[PDB]
């Protein structure tokens, strides 16, 4: 993953949490845009009503579910989707499944392979997702305008892509910050209408989906924060009472 | 002084909660997972059959019986008095909880032609063998020999209760909703 813009998402840090509204906006954008290609085969539809997620009401999740057509895993018949179904697989064959993309990518590195940047900044997966979605320029790099691979688009964040021979340095080394990706520029200004009148810029939509994709990769992040605090409090109390007990015991021999 | 063992029991105390809270998750992980909890409600509708035979349909991991009874089994003289059953409750989700174990309170229809049940023996959960098996008509549980009559009422053997009747209703005269 290429070096990202450090987006200040609300879920970051020990006290950070998901904004339910931003999750609902991100879900809307995924539904209207990404579901055309990208699956979420590990995400059960019923999780949309789950505490600490979008928390849609159950009848609205059911309404949502019925938009899908599901080949029934026992009947063989195709039917409307149910909340107990998962999101579909990727419709476009080479589009990666997005169920885990916010964990399966790192945005921060080193320095010198020491990993301390990830220690302060985290893994940076949501920032990488945002950086890809925001990473298509209005025109290519000035180098090799005659040699862009057909069916691919330059993206500033993407590092796994092909590069024209003319853009490689002689060591086989990439001159460009980005590389060419098969994903066409997906977001466009005001592409999705937020019914509350929220900002529909590409930056807003990219952030909202990055937050939704973080929730898709870790629905129980909130519960993990709380389990963290409660364990830390128990072991703090126990540590102090053990320390005082140890001090009283060992005072008795010196 | 004694304020020594106040502290020693307080530290022992922080330990048994931290450990007690550590042990509960290792138990609670075996309680039903959220997928299994989601399967607790399902919607379905199922169609017609000839008389004198039974269907079977899966729900909640277990069979639902649907029998359309014979003339001998819709009638049976209604001969069983309420005072000679083992279980006198209707065991029926469609009527009140004070209902009795009467032929018409068991059936779904007015004539008593249609009997819908869980196919699950109320002893320990085996499927009662049907046709007209057992010594009271009705069914016979092969696992421990409980006998159910033509109304699915327990007559002999280890079972405590009549075969429970799920929430079910006709949609058309040809079909029946279960959820």
């Amino acid at each position: 993953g290429g070096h990202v813009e450090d987006v200040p998402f609300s879920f970051e840090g020990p006290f950070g949490t998901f904004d339910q509204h931003q999750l609902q906006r991100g879900l809307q954008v995924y539904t209207e845009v990404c579901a055309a290609c990208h699956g979420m085969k590990f995400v059960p539809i019923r999780s949309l009503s789950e505490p600490g997620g979008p928390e849609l009401p159950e009848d609205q999740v059911r309404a949502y579910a019925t938009q899908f057509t599901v080949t029934d895993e026992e009947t063989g018949e195709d039917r409307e989707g149910k909340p107990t179904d998962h999101f579909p697989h990727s419709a476009l064959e080479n589009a990666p499944d997005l169920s885990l993309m916010a964990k399966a990518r790192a945005g921060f590195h080193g320095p010198m392979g020491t990993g301390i940047s990830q220690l302060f900044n985290g893994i940076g997966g949501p920032e990488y997702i945002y950086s890809v979605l925001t990473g298509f320029p209005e025109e290519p790099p000035k180098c090799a305008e005659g040699h862009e691979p057909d069916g691919f688009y330059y993206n500033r964040a993407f590092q796994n892509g092909s590069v024209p021979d003319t853009c490689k340095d002689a060591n086989g080394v990439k001159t460009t910050a980005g590389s060419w990706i098969a994903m066409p520029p997906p977001l466009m200004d005001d592409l999705v209408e937020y019914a509350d009148g929220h900002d529909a810029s590409v930056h807003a939509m990219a952030e909202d989906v990055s937050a939704f994709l973080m929730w898709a990769a870790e629905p129980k992040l909130m519960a993990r924060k709380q389990a963290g605090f409660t364990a830390v409090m128990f072991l703090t109390v126990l540590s102090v009472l053990l320390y005082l007990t140890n001090k009283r015991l060992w005072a008795g021999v010196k | 002084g004694t304020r020594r063992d106040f502290l020693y029991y307080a530290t022992a105390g922080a330990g048994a909660v931290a450990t007690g809270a550590a042990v509960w998750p290792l138990i609670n992980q075996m309680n039903p997972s959220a997928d299994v909890q989601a399967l607790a409600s399902i919607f379905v509708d199922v169609s017609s059959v000839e008389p004198g035979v039974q269907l079977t349909v899966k729900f909640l991991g277990k069979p639902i019986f649907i029998r359309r009874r014979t003339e001998a089994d819709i009638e049976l003289g209604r001969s069983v008095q309420l005072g000679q059953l083992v279980d006198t409750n209707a065991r029926n989700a469609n009527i009140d909880a004070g209902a009795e174990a009467t032929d018409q309170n068991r059936t779904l229809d007015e004539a008593g032609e249609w009997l819908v049940m869980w196919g699950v023996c109320t002893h320990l959960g085996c499927v009662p063998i049907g046709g007209v098996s057992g010594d009271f008509g009705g069914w016979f549980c092969p696992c421990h020999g409980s006998h159910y009559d033509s109304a699915g009422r327990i007559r002999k053997g280890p079972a405590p209760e009549n075969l429970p009747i799920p929430l079910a209703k006709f949609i058309d005269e040809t079909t029946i909703q279960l959820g």
Partner: peptide, 29 residues
């Protein structure tokens, strides 16, 4: 008498662990 220092120790240790984990469950630091 003697035992309420032991048992009161045990209880004090008990309630203090729970109460502090409760406080942090309000999440406001």
């Amino acid at each position: 008498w003697k035992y309420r220092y032991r048992l009161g120790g045990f209880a004090s240790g008990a309630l203090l662990a729970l109460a502090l984990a409760g406080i942090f469950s309000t999440g406001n630091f």
